[PDB]
Amino acid sequence: ATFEIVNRCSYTVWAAASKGDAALDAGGRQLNSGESWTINVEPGTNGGKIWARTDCYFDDSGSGICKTGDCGGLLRCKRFGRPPTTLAEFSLNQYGKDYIDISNIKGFNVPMDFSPTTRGCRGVRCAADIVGQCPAKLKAPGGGCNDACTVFQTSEYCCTTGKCGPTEYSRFFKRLCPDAFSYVLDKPTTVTCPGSSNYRVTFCPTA
Numbered sequence: 001a002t003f004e005i006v007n008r009c010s011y012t013v014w015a016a017a018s019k020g021d022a023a024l025d026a027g028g029r030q031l032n033s034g035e036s037w038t039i040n041v042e043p044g045t046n047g048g049k050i051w052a053r054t055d056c057y058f059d060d061s062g063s064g065i066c067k068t069g070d071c072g073g074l075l076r077c078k079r080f081g082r083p084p085t086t087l088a089e090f091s092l093n094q095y096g097k098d099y100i101d102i103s104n105i106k107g108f109n110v111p112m113d114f115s116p117t118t119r120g121c122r123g124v125r126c127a128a129d130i131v132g133q134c135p136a137k138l139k140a141p142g143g144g145c146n147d148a149c150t151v152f153q154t155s156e157y158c159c160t161t162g163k164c165g166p167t168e169y170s171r172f173f174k175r176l177c178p179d180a181f182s183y184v185l186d187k188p189t190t191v192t193c194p195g196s197s198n199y200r201v202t203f204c205p206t207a
Contacts, residue, residue, distance in 0.1 A: 001041045002198040007031035009204035013052040016077040027076035043093045050088040052110040067142035068109040083107040084144035088114040088201045098193040103181040104173040109144035113205035121193035126177035127206045159184035
């Protein structure tokens with residue numbers, strides 16, 4: 001499957017792509033404002049994620065730091081990033097279908113659109129000003145808006161018993177972005193696409 005990753009933000013982002021225990025394609029790349037990066041994701045990939053990282057510094061070996069979404073200090077991510085991270089999530093070729101979603105379960109840093117470039121399904125978007133409106137206790141100093149689990153580490157926010165309800169914090173994310181997951185047991189906003197669809201992830205689709 002092909003993913004085109006487009007940075008429409010006025011600022012540089014460092015895109016990342018991983019399935020948690022391995023990079024997808026190169027795993028990461030700098031995207032200046034307007035740049036597009038095309039990657040190839042193996043069919044059958046389960047639990048892949050794409051996200052943006054902000055305010056990164058990397059040396060020549062590809063080692064450094066980002067203020068959001070850092071994946072163990074690497075330019076080319078092999079593992080998932082540090083919250084807060086708006087997440088494009090996908091599982092491909094699962095019994096003939098692709099499944100895609102956007103999630104705020106790990107917080108929000110950059111607005112995102114996640115759409116097929118092939119026919120058969122619709123895209124999803126979270127493009128509200130979540131950082132600007134972020135509740136005081138969820139604000140991340142390095143930028144972004146943390147989820148409540150990351151901040152408070154309770155069974156209720158993290159849903160660690162498999163039983164939890166919505167919270168004042170999850171409802172904030174859900175109000176601003178109804179089409180993204182706001183907590184673990186949120187009513188699913190997953191979109192079903194034909195197996196082997198292709199996609200575009202656009203950072204700052206509006207702004």
